[PDB]
């Protein structure tokens, strides 16, 4: 039938850093040319807020409209499990569509972070794998990055979170570096951001032994 609504949560990194501003995003698609007006109402824990920013409708290649409303949120509100409701009204719907999102429920567990040098065997190769293990974290929302001497290293890949036997999560991040850059004795760092870390942040470093 009528238009459809998708309510997106904030980036987890955004909810964790003071310098950032997390947002909830409510997207309406399949809005017809006949009935193009879209009204948004937003609620935080049941009380209406009036400070959402709604963008002008954009005509898509398929000739429908797409309308987006973005609500800026407080880091603490989100992290304390407050609920965010986007209510969408449009002539082609008999009743408004309501979507509610909140942070995943459950007791936060502090991740442990470990860095692992390459296996001796990997030294015949021209590039080496530096490993960062992150384990025992809940919920699974997390950001993992790498840095060397104060500059972001981009040549890493991170596995999705994996459910561990104790109900927590673990993951591995693998930064690939030139073997000579490792043999040089650079300090490489694994940056982890999780809600249950002190200052939402921790750094574990790796270097030639």
């Amino acid at each position: 039938g009528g238009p459809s609504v998708f309510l997106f949560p904030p980036k987890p990194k955004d909810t964790l850093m003071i310098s950032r501003t997390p947002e909830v995003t409510c997207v309406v698609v399949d809005v017809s040319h006949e009935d193009p007006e879209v009204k948004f109402n937003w609620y935080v824990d049941g009380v209406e807020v009036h400070n959402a920013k709604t963008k002008p409708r954009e005509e898509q290649y398929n000739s429908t409209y797409r309308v987006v409303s973005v609500l800026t949120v407080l880091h603490q509100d989100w992290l304390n499990g407050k609920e965010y409701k986007c209510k969408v009204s449009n002539k082609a719907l008999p009743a408004p569509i309501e979507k509610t999102i909140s942070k995943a429920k459950g007791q936060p567990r502090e991740p442990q972070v470990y860095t692992l040098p390459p296996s001796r065997d990997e030294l015949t190769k021209n590039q080496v794998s530096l490993t960062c293990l992150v384990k025992g974290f809940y919920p699974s929302d997390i950001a993992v990055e790498w840095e060397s001497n104060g500059q972001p290293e981009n040549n890493y890949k991170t596995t999705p979170p994996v459910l561990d036997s104790d109900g927590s999560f673990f993951l591995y991040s693998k930064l690939t570096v030139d073997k000579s850059r490792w043999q040089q004795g650079n300090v490489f760092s694994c940056s982890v951001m999780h809600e249950a870390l002190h200052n939402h942040y921790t750094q574990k470093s790796l270097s030639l032994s």
Partner: protein, 165 residues
């Protein structure tokens, strides 16, 4: 020497399997029907296809006692979910264009789009005929329609539509 005439009802010569098609023979008493240049049983003035299958495709000619044999009329039975139907392919300026996104067994279709040259030209929440009240040169092009049958996303074959000055 009056030629008999085969009329289609409803007028679409492209149909989907399971569509009903009536072929009416217009002459002037008794009737005969040829399918692919071969006699079929019916001697009724209107030959009725209850539920169309592919083998029903091809050429139909009829004749009555007071008629000579009719020109062939083509019927195309397509297999699929959707068929974009039209009264004709060629239109002149200011004519109305009426396209229909016919669905198999008339199955409820939603979130329907009519595309012109790969670009959406009209979208409906519910299956509806596409209407251009007065044709322009810029309306010619390649058209198809697509939609949702429950949750299955399906698509018609393309048709060419021309508008002349």
């Amino acid at each position: 020497l009056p030629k008999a005439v085969v009329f289609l009802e409803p007028q679409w010569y492209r149909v989907l399997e399971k569509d009903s098609v009536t072929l009416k023979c217009q002459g002037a008493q008794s009737t005969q029907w040829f399918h692919n240049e071969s006699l079929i049983s019916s001697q009724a003035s209107s030959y009725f296809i209850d539920a169309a299958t592919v083998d029903d495709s091809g050429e139909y000619r009829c004749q009555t006692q007071l008629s000579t044999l009719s020109d062939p009329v083509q019927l195309e039975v397509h297999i699929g979910w959707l068929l974009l139907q039209a009264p004709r392919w060629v239109f002149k300026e200011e004519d109305p264009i009426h396209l229909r996104c016919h669905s198999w067994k008339n199955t409820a279709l939603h979130k329907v789009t009519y595309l012109q040259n790969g670009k959406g030209r009209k979208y409906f929440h519910h299956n509806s005929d596409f209407y251009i009240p007065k044709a322009t040169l810029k309306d010619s092009g390649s058209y198809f329609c697509r939609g949702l049958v429950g949750s299955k996303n399906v698509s018609s074959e393309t048709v060419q539509i021309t508008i002349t000055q």
